[PDB]
Ligand binder design. Structure first.
Ligand SMILES: Nc1ncnc2c1ncn2[C@@H]1O[C@H](COP(=O)(O)OP(=O)(O)O)[C@@H](O)[C@H]1O
Ligand SMILES: Nc1ncnc2c1ncn2[C@@H]1O[C@H](COP(=O)(O)OP(=O)(O)O)[C@@H](O)[C@H]1O
Ligand SMILES: Nc1ncnc2c1ncn2[C@@H]1O[C@H](COP(=O)(O)OP(=O)(O)O)[C@@H](O)[C@H]1O
Lengths: 362, 441, 449, 38, 459
């Protein structure tokens, strides 16, 4: 019978028999969809509905061969704010004229009267004082200060540079003679100095190594990383934006919503930086130093909701083509090359696309 | 290990007539209930009918779980059998309704087939090029059968796998081209001697024969719940396992239901509907029952089996009682199975199976006494005394459990009824419901 | 294909005049209720009305849910039918009135024409260009990418915004790939390798795809079906941009959020632009709140305001309960379990028990729906239940009796196979007798209270 | 074809393995391991 | 760096420090007093069979109830069971109160502890080379590749340990690890043979004087052999496998690294994960490369569990991999925590109680209390006149065992404060007057809080 794609469109258009008459026009498109639905509406690469503004190309002929693609994507939801609020001191943290508090308050609350500044920490570093432990946590006063002022993203970028040296000590300082040695300034990192995760990676029988990767292995072995997506969001939108008639807003939009340091951290070192680092006379530590964007869990859909039509979908979208595929394979084994005749000339083009997919010959 | 039901290996019915044998496959008695469960089991296998709720009812023991475990064994691994304790539904990460929705959708399999393609050959050479300071990697693999040699280009993902596997010339390897996984099968050359730290010399193998590429049809079964989790997300598919998944939106499920139907019409997938077994079902709230009753009505609903020990008992989350503790408009949708307490010869046969499963050689008089204990103390207690008497017998090096060991076990360990009397005989010294107690002599 | 409680229901079975045929489209009886449900279908198909309430009132097993699913089939696929139970409203992520609003806006659909403005080609050149920033500490930044795209109708060179190069980079595009670029979102898709240089000897399992036919720049148009709730969720959790918020918003765990009235109001303005632009048809649908007695007095008091909204779906409630205590309001009893304030808003369709010959008819409709070929004496037997026992108990026996008959080698179910089904599979009342007789006293073999 | 300036190449076969280093990396820090630093 | 303290390694004494075991013959019969116990000969013999039940790997999912009044030694018996098993078998004690987490459903908290009580013992061989890098030196290849000019066939590395040094010939691919890891002569590294890569521990402290300032700490030369090949035995619980799979630790992406910078919130580990973990574990057991070592989940004040916890335990105990559960309860006939209409013995639902082996614990005779006072005194280090012993034991009969044991330390203070190296009646008669029991204090309450008032207790 008809494939569900055919059956849906055929039913919707044959329902017009109840509405009108035009019968010849209708039964012509009956014959169309009953041959292949891609004659009636071609399956083509598609994505969710975009609930946003973009700049349309008004002409192709005027466009030329070199064109600049700006990022035009903006929200249709659009939050108009006066510059009195958004720029001239209605943001309490933004110092300037009018907002006379923010400049004082930033210095005193974040530095002068801030307990994590090294001068304050250094006064609290002995005995029963609140930073007594900082000798045995592996951070310096500088790293503690940094970690208390930078956000979780910036701190996570800093983690990307570090070496898990306490895990290597677990491999080397094993024996009674080694006394399970640990550097005394890392004394309190007990669970880093003693952790099966390090040992399981060095033993040649990977038994506990595999027991710790069970979930990620079977997820992959189930093919869930490769199976087609069964759903996606029906609508998609870019972030809502403030709209303010000032230049400071446009700069601050670019500084936050297109934040260069976050983007550089995610996407890694720039190609000239890689060249400079590899041709230099002495080694240099790049930033970040690698792309910190994760691997996508779906190994084929990656980071976008765009679908590309499969040729297997095209084959099964026509019941005749699905049935013919078995008959043509039988006829191939029967020794016949493909030879067919069509009432609609455009169906010959789809069969050429079908045959150039299958690589069977006319 | 040996667990409470490890002797149950099926339902013990004639596959032709569904007649229950009086004892087989480790089940004993309950013949009316075992035949009923066998009719349910067949309409599970047939798949045709969705959304049947069958309640197994009875006093404590009498094998209601044992029957449900016999059904699970008879379905085998392929059909989903989601065991759920009704107290699992009260999550803090999701509502009871969402927790039930996930439990239903865990019980419907999608059985998806694909043609993989695989390689099998000796590695003759490897070349890898690496960008200093990281980034790009490139390489070529030269791989061999008795009948072919070919040079395959390698991407970074494959070079990571090759180096993680520490692939070397003279290795026999297989590559699943679709997934990209590599496995070393062995080596055809000796392990070299020019280098140290080369590590373990794997199995010797002759070189693979035939063509390098072979197609391979493989089949994977995934739940509707596993399709839900990975289609509600871009990233974080470990939520299949960690359980981090939130309350999944219904738009995603509506889409998946439509697509799985389409995959069935395409012949890409077979839907394999299985069982959700809700043990202790009386523990659900009125809000849970008023969800299941309409969740059952969907075409993708599994067959739901339940067990309850409860009499005419209070429904949780409301002010009133009902049979089984289950709402009447819920029980309206249920066909009920009743299990019956065992006779002494049924007790004797069960205890013999428990003894054989634990590999304990009871003397005949010990089995008689355990049967007498079974009648008065209960089947579980009489079961617990079998392993206990085996240990006591081992203290005295006895080659069989004698009556003395069962009596010694009966002496050391109290049954419930005797413990209730012990409590009543010490109401002054135990903490009362008033919280009062006397600590003095 | 699988057979379920309502597979026999195909529609309301009305005449063109809107009178019910006494047995049609799978129904038997309920004619006055099927006629009232027809006038509700007319109220829905005529888009003019918002926020009307219907209550299907009637005891359990009187086909209230069959009526609601029949409405869902008379409306067809185009109109949104949004079924929920009252027990779905208690989310752990967001307040229960959020879930109601989400379901109200999920029950309003939109069909909208969309132009996708895209570039397609084989990547023939890709050349990044960059600036040495002042000392921000993150180092050099790519200022732009120059990329060459080749299609069948020649080629074009694109100087991309670096925001779009990040899409190209996270898509792992290379020279010689075929890519799709969507200028709506700045989003990218790697379609494959070219069919050029499509040699077999890659471990990479590449999909080689033909060069895009046609012009390298295209402006295809497609019609999208969306709900208002789909727009709310898109704009509350933005994910379609190439900005950092959209990027990280795909890495974070998805979670529901208490979408504000402010957002919903401003999406009404956006959708009304699509209407005035002529690119969208508004298609309001229906919300079926089954088991509406499981709502609570905060849900019902919210529904007052929600139905007064200048756009709201039709709401169909169903309840099976007499004079009952309102949940969350143990001081207040009312009929149907619905507050007396809210019941005034509804049109009540009362629903009635079936007669014995209707049960016989339903049993025969249901038997042939399941493919249970059933003798007339066997039909009469099953229809003695439904009178003496619930109707549902009749229909549930048909499958066991079929199994037992076929195990007995019969082609068709006799009275014997039902009489065995009646014995293996008890009704609630016979089981309730077993409880009261066996649990007549406590003990080792008693039922637990 | 003259080799890439910065792809160092490892190759392994029956004869064991070798690493070959581009002439552009000799005299860089990447040459130091090979005895061919600045 | 740290200034080590030379003082004696004594130990603190707690309420159970005197208990050392169950005190049983090889026939399993209890000795009338032994290993710190006095009496409870029945309950000690029963616990001795439970001990042999646990040490025999047939057990799965059995339940025990220690039933008896407060003060009757049920926690002492559980600790004695734990000591009889020793450290190689997991003993996981919790109260029922610990199950009411805010952070996951309580059936998850109980299943975590249920799996904590199950151990796995994995044997593997560690195989490394380690040392200070004495040298790095390329071997130029016989057949250089055209166009490169440099071609190395071997890299040679010298590694010195405290116990010797070796000339090590390595595949040149190690250049990648050395260049990334920035290994230098005088750094301490290891080579692992399952990868051929290397990792840097640090610079050898032989070079700590190379500069007046350098920005790294130095590490000692490895004190083992230059080449290690050792079997290693890893203590693992199945709960460790749960967490290690459900929250991988080493991930190098931003979301992993942001994850490890934020609190490691518990998650409702799926049964699908746990059931696959079990299957792979059972595979490796059948290979014989691992031992399963099921241990004891001990739940004290188990009457604090509710009926939802107990109904889940039904399913949990039916698992084919499960610890033994030992419950302790003192709640008479009492209302079930989560089923206010239902009373049952021990506060355990009758459904669940039928599963447990109940062990009763009885009160103590006046002469047993006296023997306990003797055992406790010598454990605290207190020494008593016999008239002080008899006075303490008399309070044990009239008031409570626990109260009398708590008088020993106060009276020892007062004795030494009065210059006496042993406690006498004059000190006991004073300890008992500074430190009241609950009854004498309840009498003060009953007399003083007869009404509201300016000096009244608040009722
Ligand atoms: N008919 C039977 N055949 C074999 N074992 C049984 C049978 N009935 C009960 N048992 C065993 O006795 C114990 C109690 O039965 P169970 O199924 O747990 O009862 P409940 O209905 O309370 O779950 C279990 O160990 C079970 O395996
Ligand atoms: N008039 C009718 N004609 C045919 N089948 C019916 C009719 N009324 C109810 N049924 C069927 O009887 C069963 C119970 O009806 P249901 O809608 O569940 O009642 P309620 O929802 O009020 O509990 C369902 O299988 C339903 O399809
Ligand atoms: N049989 C015994 N022999 C020696 N000490 C005991 C004995 N029974 C109890 N004790 C000690 O007396 C106190 C009371 O016992 P405990 O186990 O705490 O009671 P419960 O089980 O009611 O909590 C503890 O300090 C315990 O160590």
């Amino acid at each position: 019978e008809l494939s569900y794609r055919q059956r849906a469109m055929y039913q919707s258009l044959r329902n017009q028999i109840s509405i009108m008459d035009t019968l010849m026009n209708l039964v012509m498109q009956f014959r169309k969809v009953c041959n292949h639905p891609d004659l009636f509406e071609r399956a083509d690469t598609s994505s969710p509905f975009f609930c946003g503004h973009f700049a349309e190309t008004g002409s192709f002929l005027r466009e030329g061969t070199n064109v600049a693609l700006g990022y035009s994507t903006r929200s249709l939801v659009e939050y108009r704010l006066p510059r009195l609020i958004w720029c001239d001191g209605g943001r309490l943290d933004k110092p300037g004229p009018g907002n006379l508090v923010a400049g004082f308050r930033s210095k005193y609350l974040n530095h002068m009267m801030n307990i994590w500044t090294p001068e304050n920490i250094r006064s609290s570093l002995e005995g029963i004082e609140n930073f007594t432990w900082l000798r045995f946590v592996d951070t310096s006063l500088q790293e503690a200060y940094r970690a208390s002022h930078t956000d979780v993203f910036a701190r996570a970028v800093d983690l990307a540079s570090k070496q898990n040296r306490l895990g290597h000590m677990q491999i080397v300082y094993d024996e009674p003679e080694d006394k399970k040695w640990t550097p005394v300034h890392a004394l309190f990192q007990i669970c880093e100095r003693e952790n099966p995760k390090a040992v399981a990676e060095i033993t040649t029988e990977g038994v506990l190594r595999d027991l710790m990767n069970i979930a990620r292995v079977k997820y992959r072995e189930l093919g869930l990383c490769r199976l087609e997506k069964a759903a996606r969001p029906r609508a998609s939108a870019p972030p809502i934006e403030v709209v303010c008639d000032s230049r400071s807003a446009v700069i601050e939009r670019e500084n936050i919503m297109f934040h260069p340091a976050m983007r550089k951290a995610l996407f890694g070192p720039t190609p000239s930086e890689i060249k400079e680092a590899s041709f230099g006379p002495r080694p240099v530590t790049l930033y970040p130093p690698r792309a910190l964007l994760p691997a996508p869990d779906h190994d084929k859909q990656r980071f976008t909701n765009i679908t590309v039509p499969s040729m297997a979908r095209f084959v099964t979208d026509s019941g005749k083509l699905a049935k013919l595929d078995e008959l043509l394979r039988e006829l191939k084994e029967g020794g016949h090359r493909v030879l067919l005749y069509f009432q609609m000339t455009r169906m010959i083009d789809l069969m050429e696309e079908y045959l150039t997919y299958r690589n069977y010959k006319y | 290990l040996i667990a409470a039901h490890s002797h149950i290996r099926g339902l013990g019915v004639d596959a032709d007539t569904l007649e229950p044998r009086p004892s087989s496959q480790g089940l004993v008695g309950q013949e009316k209930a075992r035949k009923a469960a066998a009719v349910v089991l067949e309409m599970i296998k047939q798949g045709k009918i969705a959304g049947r709720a069958v309640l197994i009812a009875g006093p404590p023991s009498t094998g209601k779980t044992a029957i449900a475990m016999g059904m699970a064994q008879s379905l085998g691994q392929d059909v989903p059998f989601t065991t759920l304790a009704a107290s699992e539904i009260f999550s803090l990460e999701m509502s009871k309704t969402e927790a039930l929705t996930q439990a239903f959708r865990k019980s419907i399999g999608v059985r998806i087939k694909e043609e993989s393609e695989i390689m099998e050959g000796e590695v003759v050479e490897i070349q890898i090029d690496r960008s200093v300071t990281g980034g790009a990697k490139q390489g070529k693999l030269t791989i061999k059968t008795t009948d072919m040699e070919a040079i395959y280009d390698m991407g970074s993902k494959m070079i990571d796998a090759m180096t993680k596997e520490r692939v070397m010339a003279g290795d026999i390897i297989s590559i699943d081209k679709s997934s990209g996984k590599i496995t070393k099968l062995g080596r055809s050359y000796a392990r070299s001697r020019d280098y140290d730290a080369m590590g373990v010399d794997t199995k010797f193998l002759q070189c693979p024969e035939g063509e390098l590429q072979k197609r391979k049809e493989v089949v994977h079964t995934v739940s509707l719940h596993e399709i839900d989790v990975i289609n509600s997300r871009t990233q974080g598919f470990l939520a299949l396992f960690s359980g981090d998944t939130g309350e999944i939106r219904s738009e995603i499920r509506d889409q998946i239901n439509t697509k799985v139907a389409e995959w069935k019409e395409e012949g890409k997938a077979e839907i394999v509907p299985g069982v959700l077994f809700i043990d202790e079902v009386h523990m659900l709230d009125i809000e849970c029952f008023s969800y299941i009753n309409r969740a059952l009505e969907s075409d993708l609903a599994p067959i739901v089996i339940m067990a309850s020990n409860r009499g005419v008992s209070r429904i949780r989350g409301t002010d009133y009682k009902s049979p089984h503790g289950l709402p009447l408009d819920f029980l309206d949708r249920v066909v009920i199975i009743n299990t019956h307490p065992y006779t002494p010869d049924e007790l004797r046969q069960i205890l013999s199976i428990r003894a054989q499963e634990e590999e304990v050689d009871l003397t005949p008089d010990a089995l008689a006494l355990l049967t007498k204990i079974g009648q008065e103390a209960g089947l579980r207690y009489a079961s617990n005394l079998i392993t206990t008497s085996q240990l006591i017998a081992a203290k005295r090096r006895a080659k069989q459990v004698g009556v003395e060991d069962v009596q010694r076990s009966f002496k050391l360990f109290y049954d419930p009824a005797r413990s209730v009397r012990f409590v009543q005989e010490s109401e002054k010294r135990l903490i009362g419901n008033d919280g009062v107690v006397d600590f003095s002599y | 294909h699988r057979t379920a409680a309502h597979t026999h229901i195909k529609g309301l079975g009305l005449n063109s005049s809107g009178i019910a045929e006494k047995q049609a489209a799978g129904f038997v009886g309920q004619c006055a209720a099927r006629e009232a449900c027809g006038v509700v279908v007319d109220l829905i198909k005529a888009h003019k009305m918002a926020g009307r309430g219907v209550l299907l009132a009637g005891g359990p097993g009187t086909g209230k849910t069959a009526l609601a699913l029949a409405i869902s089939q008379e409306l067809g696929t185009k109109i949104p039918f949004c079924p929920i139970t009252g027990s779905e409203i208690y989310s752990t992520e967001v307040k229960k009135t959020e879930v109601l609003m989400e379901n109200f806006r999920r029950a309003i659909g939109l069909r909208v024409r969309e132009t996708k403005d895209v570039y397609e080609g084989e990547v023939t050149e890709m050349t990044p260009e960059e600036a040495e920033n002042p000392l921000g500490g993150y180092g050099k930044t790519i200022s732009t990418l120059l990329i060459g795209l080749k299609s069948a109708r020649g080629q074009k060179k694109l100087r991309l915004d670096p925001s779009i190069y990040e899409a190209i980079q996270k898509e792992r595009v290379q020279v010689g790939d075929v890519i799709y670029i969507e200028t709506n979102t700045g989003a990218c898709k790697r379609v494959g390798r070219s069919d050029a240089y499509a040699t077999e000897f890659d471990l990479e399992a590449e999909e080689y795809v033909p060069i895009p036919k046609g012009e390298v720049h295209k402006k295809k148009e497609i019609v999208q079906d969306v709900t208002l709730h789909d727009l709310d969720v898109a704009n509350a959790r933005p994910q379609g941009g190439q900005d950092i918020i959209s990027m990280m918003g795909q890495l974070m765990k998805p979670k529901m959020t208490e979408i504000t009235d402010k957002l919903r109001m401003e999406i009404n303005k956006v959708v009304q632009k699509y209407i005035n632009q002529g690119v969208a048809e508004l298609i309001p649908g229906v919300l079926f709140i089954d088991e509406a007695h499981m709502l609570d007095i905060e849900c019902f008091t919210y529904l007052n305001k929600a139905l007064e909204s200048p756009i709201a779906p039709i709401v169909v409630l169903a309840s099976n309960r007499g004079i009952a205590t309102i949940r969350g309001a143990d001081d207040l009893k009312a009929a149907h379990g619905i507050p007396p304030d809210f019941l005034q808003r509804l049109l009540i369709i009362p629903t009635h028990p079936y007669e014995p010959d209707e049960i016989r008819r339903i049993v025969r409709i249901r038997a042939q729906t399941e493919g249970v070929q059933l003798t007339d004496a066997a039909v009469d037997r099953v229809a003695e239940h439904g009178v003496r026992i619930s109707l549902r108990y009749c229909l549930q026996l048909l499958a066991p009796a079929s199994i037992l008959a076929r195990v007995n080698g019969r082609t068709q179910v006799d009275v014997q196979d039902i009489a065995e089904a009646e014995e293996l599979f008890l009704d609630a009342r016979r089981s309730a007798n077993i409880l009261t007789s066996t649990g007549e006293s406590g003990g080792l073999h008693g039922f637990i209270s | 074809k003259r080799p890439d300036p910065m792809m160092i190449r490892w190759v392994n076969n029956k004869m064991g393995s070798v690493v070959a280093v581009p002439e552009e990396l000799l005299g860089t820090h990447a040459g130091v391991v090979f005895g061919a630093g600045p």
